[PDB]
Amino acid sequence: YSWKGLRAAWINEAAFRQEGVAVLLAVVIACWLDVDACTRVLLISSVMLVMIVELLNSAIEAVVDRIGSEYHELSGRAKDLGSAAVLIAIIDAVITWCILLWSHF
Amino acid sequence: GFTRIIKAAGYSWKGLRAAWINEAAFRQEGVAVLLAVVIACWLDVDACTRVLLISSVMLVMIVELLNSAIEAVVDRIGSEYHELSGRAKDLGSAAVLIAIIDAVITWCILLWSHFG
Amino acid sequence: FTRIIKAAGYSWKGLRAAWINEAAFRQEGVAVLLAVVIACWLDVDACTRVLLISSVMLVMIVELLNSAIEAVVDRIGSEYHELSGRAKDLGSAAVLIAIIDAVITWCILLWSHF
Ligand SMILES: Nc1ncnc2c1ncn2[C@@H]1O[C@H](COP(=O)(O)OP(=O)(O)CP(=O)(O)O)[C@@H](O)[C@H]1O
Ligand SMILES: CCCCCCCC/C=C\CCCCCCCC(=O)OC[C@H](O)CO
Ligand SMILES: CCCCCCCC/C=C\CCCCCCCC(=O)OC[C@H](O)CO
Ligand SMILES: CCCCCCCC/C=C\CCCCCCCC(=O)OC[C@H](O)CO
Ligand SMILES: CCCCCCCC/C=C\CCCCCCCC(=O)OC[C@H](O)CO
Ligand SMILES: CCCCCCCC/C=C\CCCCCCCC(=O)OC[C@H](O)CO
Ligand SMILES: CCCCCCCC/C=C\CCCCCCCC(=O)OC[C@H](O)CO
Ligand SMILES: [Cl-]
Ligand code: NA
Ligand code: NA
Ligand code: NA
Ligand SMILES: [Zn+2]
Ligand SMILES: [Zn+2]
């Protein structure tokens, strides 16, 4: 499952690796900045949220491919919707980091 | 290959229109969400509070999009197969509810502490 | 308002379904109750209290989405007779990251308070 899924996500999905690095960067940076606990949490969790949604998107993509590689309007709808969910998470992470850092750095 | 980043962006945007055009729940929650975001940007609150007000509400949109994706998959199954238990869609609806409840709690707790 | 009652009944049906079939959801249900009580019984500020609860609530949300994905796979698995696991693996991975995130949240916040 989880550890197995993470391994699959890392090797197979390139977007996931970039997020993994981003999580590592977020944690290191959040710990290096002189900020309060809530801020430190918000900096890390927001980026981890992107990874969570990305994994779910990858899961949906796996189901759709399993149904069929062939082209349908509901197959690509699902993948688009999943892709859209990741975007909002990223938008959320950008807004979060902006608001917090605009005050400190 | 920065070119692909644009490929992925077009996807998400296509998904957004699809959620908007096809899902009514997405249209109504989006209005409440976008309204909430605007208010959160204009309140006299600290950064952490402003972030919590926005993120809790945007999470509702994230979960809804994931719910819509799951519904799309189910509908894809339903076009080939005849019998739909509805269980997958029920769970997706449950996920959105918990997200909305969470957003209500977040806004209640935060607004009650500063303005209380 | 008619659809809202219908959408709520769906959600409630999904919540009840999750409770009976998945033991992990019952544990998370317990954890949410504990998180709220603990956050409300500690003398902490609003932002930390929101984060203590929301981090745990996120785990329940991801689990519900994961269970939905599992249900779809099973419906397909009943038709094609296929036992590939990536959809279920990835869904479980998403829940793990949510749990790890919640642990970090509780650690960082409580280490700062105490
Ligand atoms: N079976 C299918 N039927 C219809 N459209 C499909 C499809 N498979 C893919 N598409 C379309 O192509 C896009 C890319 O497919 P897919 O979602 O699998 O991308 P991907 O895994 O390469 C990138 P990412 O993981 O970042 O989302 C989808 O967003 C959708 O618009
Ligand atoms: C104001 C500055 C704030 C900076 C900090 C904000 C938080 C980090 C943002 C996103 C995490 C993930 C990064 C983007 C993930 C890759 C994008 C993607 O999915 O692209 C398609 C794929 O890469 C095909 O190659
Ligand atoms: C104060 C308010 C400031 C607000 C500022 C907000 C500006 C937009 C921010 C980030 C966009 C980053 C680029 C978009 C990310 C790539 C597209 C995407 O979502 O790709 C997912 C991909 O398919 C993988 O699954
Ligand atoms: C202590 C007093 C404090 C009071 C402050 C409370 C403010 C709640 C704020 C945001 C919730 C946002 C929820 C966004 C999603 C809900 C959408 C929804 O359910 O909409 C109803 C539907 O449209 C009908 O037809
Ligand atoms: C201050 C800024 C306020 C901004 C405006 C906020 C207005 C709405 C508030 C609460 C509505 C709560 C609604 C709760 C009903 C949920 C129904 C449900 O379970 O829906 C499942 C979902 O629709 C499946 O997609
Ligand atoms: C500060 C205010 C805090 C407010 C409190 C936080 C609310 C958390 C939300 C949902 C929990 C739902 C738990 C799952 C319930 C499922 C239904 C159930 O128990 O079903 C069993 C059934 O009886 C078998 O026959
Ligand atoms: C400070 C310790 C106080 C003692 C009591 C703590 C309980 C409060 C809940 C969560 C804490 C953070 C844990 C992070 C994950 C929470 C959800 C979780 O682990 O749920 C069970 C899981 O699904 C596997 O079955
Ligand atoms: Cl059980
Ligand atoms: Na159609
Ligand atoms: Na729907
Ligand atoms: Na299960
Ligand atoms: Zn993919
Ligand atoms: Zn995709």
Residue numbers in the entry:
A (entry chain C): 16 to 120
B (entry chain B): 6 to 121
C (entry chain A): 7 to 120
What did the authors write?
Therefore, the enzyme was co-crystallized with the non-hydrolysable ATP analogue, adenylylmethylenediphosphonate (ACP). Best crystals, providing a ternary complex structure with ACP and lipid bound at 2.7 Å resolution, were obtained with Δ4-DgkA grown in 9.9 MAG at 4 °C and soaked with zinc-ACP. Like the apo-enzyme, the ternary complex is a homo-trimer. In the complex, asBC has zinc-ACP and lipid bound. The zinc-ACP is close to fully extended and is secured by electrostatic, hydrogen bonding and hydrophobic interactions along its length on the relatively flat, cytosol-exposed surface of H2C and H3C. The two zinc atoms (Zn1, Zn2) bound to ACP were identified and positioned in the complex by anomalous scattering. They are bidentately coordinated, respectively, by the β- and γ- and the α- and γ-phosphates of ACP and fasten the polyphosphate to conserved residues Glu28C and Glu76C in the active site in ways that make catalytic sense. The two hydroxyls of ribose in ACP are tightly hydrogen bonded to the side-chain carboxyl of the essential Asp95C. The purine ring of ACP is locked in position by hydrogen bonds between the N1 and N6 of adenine and the backbone linkage of His87C and Glu85C, respectively, in CLC. MAG1 has been modelled into the electron density map with its headgroup deep in the protein positioned at the level of the membrane interface with its reactive 1-OH next to the γ-phosphate of ACP. Further, the γ-phosphate of ATP should be proximal to the 1-OH of the lipid substrate. This is what was observed in the ternary complex where the two entities are poised for reaction ∼4 Å apart.
Diacylglycerol kinase (DgkA) is the smallest known kinase. In Escherichia coli, it is responsible for the adenosine triphosphate (ATP)-dependent phosphorylation of diacylglycerol (DAG) to phosphatidic acid used in periplasm membrane-derived oligosaccharide synthesis in response to osmotic shock1. The enzyme has long served as a model for integral membrane enzymology, folding, assembly and stability. It is a trimer with three active sites of the shared sites type that exhibits moderate positive heteroallostery, random-binding kinetics and lipid substrate promiscuity. Each subunit has four helices, three of which are largely membrane embedded (H1-3), whereas the fourth, an N-terminal amphiphilic surface helix (SH), anchors the protein at the membrane interface.
